[PDB]
Every structure is written in C-alpha cells, then in structure tokens.
RNA sequence: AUGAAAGUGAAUGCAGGUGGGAACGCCCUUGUGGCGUGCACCAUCGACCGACCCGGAAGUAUGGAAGGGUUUGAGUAAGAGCAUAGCUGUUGGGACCCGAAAGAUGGUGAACCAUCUAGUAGCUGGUUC
RNA sequence: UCAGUAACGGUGAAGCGGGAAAAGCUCAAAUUUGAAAUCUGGCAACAUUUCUUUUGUUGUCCGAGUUGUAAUUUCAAGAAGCUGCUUUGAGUGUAGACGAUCGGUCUAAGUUCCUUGGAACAGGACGUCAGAGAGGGUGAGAACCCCGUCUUUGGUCGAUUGGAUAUGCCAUAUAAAGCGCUUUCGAAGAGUCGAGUUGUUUGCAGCUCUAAAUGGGUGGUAAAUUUCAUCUAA
C-alpha cells in the first residue's frame, strides 16, 4: 500500500535426526499409549524411531516405568541403560 | 549382514538370491572365430615399427628398456605389460 | 529472463483436459499403468517403499507371463533393474498375480475366447489402479515380547568395537599377511 | 549441542539451591508490616553434555568406564518457533529524476548511422499537501 | 526440493525424494547357398482419391545389386537342435451408434396510458417473461423496440470424415511366431579410446604418438595399487 508509505508525507520536504527418551512415548498412536502405558502386560510396546525419520536415539529425559522395546539404528551410550531400569529392551535395526 | 549397520559384513540380514549372468558382461570373451581372424590378420598385416624395436630388446635380454619404451609408446603400464607378454609368446612361438 | 507464473491455473486445466481426453480415448482400459513396489536407494530413504518403472524379467518369468504379453496387456517391463532379495521377487510377484486376477482381457476377433483371456465383456470398467493395487509402506511390527537376550546385548559391544574393527580391518589384514 | 574432523552428543538436587525478586494469597483478620510464595526473572552459583588435559573398571590389538581439573559453549536444566500481512532501515537490481568525454558490434558514404546503453555521475541541478 | 549446499575463488551444480509424462526400439558384426528369395524406372491393364489434381496394385520389360539387396539376430539378448500349448489378413461394400469441424436454419415477454422533453430509452401508474436482469443499438439510464443472451454438452439439415459395433465378400493359411528345454555358440562399431601437448569455454579443438578382449569406460573401496560395484562408447 503506497498511501500509508512515507513518500505520501514528504511532499514539499524534497543424516541422523535425533530423538530423546522424553519423546519416544509421544511417537505411539494415542490408543497404543492408552492401552499399553502403565499396565502390567506380558507383551511390551515396540517403538521404531526410523519410521518417524529419526536416526539416533539420544537419552535426554526421564522415563515411565512401562517396559518398551525400541528399534533404532544408532543410540547414545546412556540412552540404553535408562531403558534397562525402565523394564523395556533395546535391539538394533540393521 | 549381522543385522547391523557397520563392519566388513554390514547390511540388513536377508537371503540373497543368486542373480543370473546378463549378456552385457559377456564382452571381452574370446570367440574361436575372431581369435582365428586375429591370428590371420597378425600373420598377414605384420607389426608396427615400435613393437619390432622392442622384440629384439627381448631377444638380447634388454627387458627393462623395452618395458619403459613400450610404456612411452602407449601411455599406461597395463597396456605396456599386456603388449610385451604377447610379443614374448610370439618370440617363443617363432 | 523473468519467468512468470500467470498461466498456472491455465496449465493445470490443460492437464485435466489432457487426462480426460486421454482416458476417454482408451476408456475400456485403465488410464494409469501399474508399477512395481521398489525401495529408494539410499540410507535416508531405504526404509520407504515407492513405485518403480517396471517389473524385472525375473518377475514376469515367475508370474507366468512372457515379456511380450506383459507389454500388450499394460504391464511395463524394466530390463535395467535386477531384483536380488527374493522378497523383492515376492512383493512384485503377487502384485502381478492380483493384477492378472482382476484383469479382464477382451477376446480378439469378434469375442470368441482365445486361450484364457476372458468370456464376459460387459464388465468393461475403467478403474484407478492404485485403488485395486495400492502401494503399501513397510509392514512394521507391534507388541513383540521377551528379547532379554538382547537386553544383555549392550549395543556398543557391537557398534563401538566392530566399527573400530571395520576401521582397522585393513591394517589388521596387512599385519597378518606381513608376518606370515 | 560440541569438535578441525572422525565422533560423541546435554534435568544434580520437588529438572536445583543461593539470595533476591510479579501479583497473589497470607494474615495480626485491618492495612502497613510481615507471613510467605515465588512467575518472568535476576544475579549468582551447585551442577548436566561436547571439546582440552591426567588417568585407564571393564567389555569384544581394540576399547572405554569411575574419578580429577575451575580451560572451553551467547550450551541442557522442564523446549518456542513456523507461516502471512504491514511499517521502518539496509544490500542488489536502471533504482528518486536530469545531465561527461568516451568504448564495443554491425552497417552507410567518401565521417555518419543503429544497437549494446536507461553506462562509468566519487558530482551539477531539481525532488510536488 | 536438494541449495545458495558441494565445489571453485563473487561464481555455483548434481545424486537422492516428491510430481507432470510415460513407449519403446532399429542396424553392422554369421549364409539361403537347393536357387537375390530384394529394389528403382519404362510400357499395358486393374483400381483408389480431401482430389479427374492423390495414392497404389498387378502383369511385363529394363536396369540396380554378389565390393551384398532380402529373411533371421542386437547383448534385455539371440542363433542352432528338442517339446506341446497358444495364436494369426499390412484386405474389401452395407446398416446403426459415437464424436470433430465447417455450412445453414429455430429461439420469452409492453413499445399500454399521464407529466417533462425536439426525441422517453426519464418520472409515475398498470402489467409480462426470466435455463433469457451478459453486452451492444435505437433522437437521454430499454430484460419485454431491435440484435442478441439462456435453453445449447440441443433440435434440424448438409457435407465429409474418428475409429470402433454388427454385417457381407474376398483372403490364402502346404503357413509363421511366443514360451519348456538346451548337448554351444554367441560374432558386438579404431586415427576411435587413450596419453602428452597448445588454445578456449571437466567438455571440445589443433598438433605428435596411438590401443586392447573379461577387454574398455566409470566410481566406492583399498592401496597408489587393489579388490568391489556398475555400464558396454567410437
């Protein structure tokens, strides 16, 4: 818009995306979280970070104590132990 | 393929199926007909002067100079070594 | 110089009329040919599944259709591609199989069934191929138990050292051939 | 996020304390004052990850941990950015307008012509209620 | 989109991914030696036409052509032997439907009264059509005076053509091809590739040399050589 401009007032005056453990439980479908988080079930949920375009699973954050299997290409050196006491397992994608 | 990412076995672990051999790779194979034709043309056409010069170099055991001179003529070591070996077989054949 | 886009609605409408004219020209047969299920070739995309150019000569041989019949009935053939993992054999095979199952070939020369083409012809219908033959993504697994043997499997025991083993394999192999 | 790169890759402590700190509650039932609480924060700090240095629990030559620095990062420490419009400033396009000789290309005639050209403008002049 | 990234030193890509569009192939390199089976042209007939203007066919003659025209084959292969399934026209009238265009034709309702005005297409009163209230003209702002607009992706009437549908008639069809197998054979493009050298924007070009058959090009590796991968130039 020229009418608001200053000229109309001067007239005359001259590859590896990263995911941390505070976010794995957000990658599930919400019904999977509803029916699998916190329930003492024999079978544990499985998370494939690669299906969300994530290469390496870093370990920042706390975890719920529900066991969960995480499938990943690469993993940070603490991210695996935190899921040990979380009761779930980590196994490595080829 | 150890179901993993790294190593001199790496890859996603599957059952590779033995693929067939395609006719494009056939190139370089010797035909008795063309091998006969090359024999005929070699016997009738003769030799260019530079391989002539190097072969009595083989005859008088002047191998190193001939190898260097053959390298100068063609340009690559493999062409040179391929040249001298076939002339030597000609030398013993004669 | 300066490429302007004032024809963008016009060019879109041209393609629509191109498809409608093309489809109406060959109405009996589907507008879009089928394509195989193929995997993008790189570490960033290799997990995904997309549509390739054509089915390799291995697959037509397995599916029981010659490379000539396939071209006539709308199956594109790719000669450059070669499929090595027998799943890629598989996933393309029933893809050809179900396409043939839903395929109806109108008999030539006044509707006398030849070989096994078809008998009915009133079932002429032009359908989207991606409807009857959609391409699916990778089948992911859900709710698998145990694997506490993988628990003791402490990741870097493979990763850190086998990566070092791979890095030093050349030097190691040179060492073994040296003192031998 | 860090590192030159291989590569590794961030709640200490109600995801902290240390003081303070917003309003509120909270009164002693007045309010004030305090009781607090502590937001943004604020400064400090405890630290948490990478680099740097010393050390090598282990675990398959390889290799890494525990631990020690008061060296390092507009680092983590309970994400705040993305898109659109407007204003203003700046950079580049002819670039607020006007104006210098010149140079090139291709032509016409025995110097001229047309294009490149809206040129080099560090200036002169003008620049609208 | 990668990406103003890699790379170069302001210049400035590409692989991958998404989408538009998709369609594949032909020769040379071997023979048919129990048949040059091939082809242009002259001449006589038969036709056909966007078309008396076009396009062919048959017959015959002549020439081209063994320094190579046909058939088969092109690396995805393929040739030659073996097997049982599958198939098949480089045709010709009629009817109907389908669309393309041109050529033409058909399109609803006030010009009824009063005032102003040179003129009513203005104002007021009373109506009408509307799949038509886009627009233009007519003596001033006209849906109803006119051309048009809408119905119209239509009715009609020609003319051809689109190719399918059915039909009729010839065809020749003693046929060839696809795929189970091989008891194997597989020819594969040279002053070209390449190397050095000079110019110019790795590419190309002049210059001298000049290749090879698992060879050659190209890269991940190694190592400076190597494996490995991928492709088959002239």
Curated annotation (Swiss-Prot), chain A:
Pfam families: Ribosomal_L27A (PF00828). Its main location: cytoplasm. Keywords: Cytoplasm, Ribonucleoprotein, Ribosomal protein. It comes from the Eukaryota. InterPro entries: Ribosomal_uL15 (IPR030878), Ribosomal_uL15/eL18 (IPR021131), Ribosomal_uL15/eL18_sf (IPR036227), Ribosomal_uL15_CS (IPR001196). Component of the large ribosomal subunit (LSU). Mature yeast ribosomes consist of a small (40S) and a large (60S) subunit. The 40S small subunit contains 1 molecule of ribosomal RNA (18S rRNA) and at least 33 different proteins. The large 60S subunit contains 3 rRNA molecules (25S, 5.8S and 5S rRNA) and at least 46 different proteins. There are 2 genes for uL15 in S.pombe. This is Large ribosomal subunit protein uL15A. It comes from Schizosaccharomyces pombe (strain 972 / ATCC 24843). The lineage of its organism: Eukaryota, Fungi, Dikarya, Ascomycota, Taphrinomycotina.
From Swiss-Prot, chain B:
There are 2 genes for eL36 in S.pombe. Pfam families: Ribosomal_L36e (PF01158). Component of the ribosome, a large ribonucleoprotein complex responsible for the synthesis of proteins in the cell. The small ribosomal subunit (SSU) binds messenger RNAs (mRNAs) and translates the encoded message by selecting cognate aminoacyl-transfer RNA (tRNA) molecules. The large subunit (LSU) contains the ribosomal catalytic site termed the peptidyl transferase center (PTC), which catalyzes the formation of peptide bonds, thereby polymerizing the amino acids delivered by tRNAs into a polypeptide chain. It comes from Schizosaccharomyces pombe (strain 972 / ATCC 24843) (Fission yeast). It is found in: Cytoplasm. Belongs to the eukaryotic ribosomal protein eL36 family. Its main location: cytoplasm. GO terms for biological process: cytoplasmic translation. GO terms for molecular function: structural constituent of ribosome. This is Large ribosomal subunit protein eL36B. Keywords: Cytoplasm, Ribonucleoprotein, Ribosomal protein. Component of the large ribosomal subunit (LSU). Mature yeast ribosomes consist of a small (40S) and a large (60S) subunit. The 40S small subunit contains 1 molecule of ribosomal RNA (18S rRNA) and at least 33 different proteins. The large 60S subunit contains 3 rRNA molecules (25S, 5.8S and 5S rRNA) and at least 46 different proteins. GO terms for cellular component: cytosol; cytosolic large ribosomal subunit; preribosome. Residues 1-31 are annotated as: Disordered. Gene3D superfamilies: 60S ribosomal protein L36.
UniProtKB/Swiss-Prot annotation, chain C:
It is found in: Cytoplasm. PROSITE patterns: RIBOSOMAL_L13E. GO terms for cellular component: cytosol; cytosolic large ribosomal subunit; preribosome. GO terms for molecular function: RNA binding; structural constituent of ribosome. The keyword Transcription regulation does not apply. It holds the Pfam family Ribosomal_L13e. One of its GO terms (biological process) is cytoplasmic translation. It comes from the Eukaryota. The keyword Phosphoprotein applies. The modification Phosphoserine is found at residues 157, 160. Keywords: Cytoplasm, Phosphoprotein, Ribonucleoprotein, Ribosomal protein. HAMAP family: Ribosomal_eL13 (MF_00499). Component of the ribosome, a large ribonucleoprotein complex responsible for the synthesis of proteins in the cell. The small ribosomal subunit (SSU) binds messenger RNAs (mRNAs) and translates the encoded message by selecting cognate aminoacyl-transfer RNA (tRNA) molecules. The large subunit (LSU) contains the ribosomal catalytic site termed the peptidyl transferase center (PTC), which catalyzes the formation of peptide bonds, thereby polymerizing the amino acids delivered by tRNAs into a polypeptide chain. Component of the large ribosomal subunit (LSU). Mature yeast ribosomes consist of a small (40S) and a large (60S) subunit. The 40S small subunit contains 1 molecule of ribosomal RNA (18S rRNA) and at least 33 different proteins. The large 60S subunit contains 3 rRNA molecules (25S, 5.8S and 5S rRNA) and at least 46 different proteins. PANTHER family: 60S RIBOSOMAL PROTEIN L13, LARGE RIBOSOMAL SUBUNIT PROTEIN EL13. Belongs to the eukaryotic ribosomal protein eL13 family. This is Large ribosomal subunit protein eL13.
């Amino acid at each position: 818009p020229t009418h608001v401009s200053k000229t109309r007032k001067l007239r005359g005056h001259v590859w590896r995306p990263t995911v941390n453990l505070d976010r794995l439980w957000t990658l599930l479908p919400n019904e999977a979280r509803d029916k699998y988080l916190g329930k003492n079930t024999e079978v544990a949920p499985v998370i494939n970070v690669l299906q969300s375009g994530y290469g390496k699973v870093l370990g920042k954050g706390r975890l719920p104590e529900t066991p969960v299997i995480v499938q990943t290409r690469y993993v940070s050196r603490r991210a695996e132990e935190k899921i040990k006491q979380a009761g779930g397992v980590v196994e490595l994608i080829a | 393929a150890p179901g993993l990412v790294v190593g001199l076995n790496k890859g996603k672990t599957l059952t590779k199926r033995q693929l067939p051999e395609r006719p494009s790779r056939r190139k370089g194979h010797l035909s008795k007909r063309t091998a006969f034709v090359r024999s005929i043309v070699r016997e009738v056409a003769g030799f260019a002067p530079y391989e002539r010069r190097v072969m009595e170099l083989i005859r008088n055991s002047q191998d190193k100079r001939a190898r260097k001179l053959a390298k100068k003529r063609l340009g690559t070591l493999k062409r040179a070594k391929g040249k001298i070996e076939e002339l030597t077989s000609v030398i013993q054949s004669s | 110089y300066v490429k302007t886009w004032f024809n963008q609605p016009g060019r879109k409408l041209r393609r629509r009329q191109a498809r409608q004219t093309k489809a109406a020209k060959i109405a009996p047969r589907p507008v879009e040919a089928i394509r195989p299920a193929v995997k993008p070739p790189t570490i960033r995309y290799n997990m995904k599944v997309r549509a390739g150019r054509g089915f390799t000569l291995e697959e037509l041989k397995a599916a029981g259709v010659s490379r000539r019949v396939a071209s006539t009935i709308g199956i594109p053939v790719d000669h450059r591609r070669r499929n090595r993992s027998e799943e890629s054999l598989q996933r393309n095979v029933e893809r050809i199989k179900v396409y043939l199952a839903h395929l109806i070939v109108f008999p030539r020369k006044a509707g006398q069934p030849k070989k096994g083409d078809a008998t009915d012809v009133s079932g002429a219908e032009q359908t989207d191929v991606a409807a009857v033959l959609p391409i699916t993504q990778e089948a992911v697994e859900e709710a698998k138990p145990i694997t506490e043997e993988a628990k003791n499997f402490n990741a870097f025991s493979t990763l850190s050292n086998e990566r070092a083993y791979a890095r030093y394999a050349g030097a190691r192999a040179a060492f073994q051939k040296k003192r031998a």
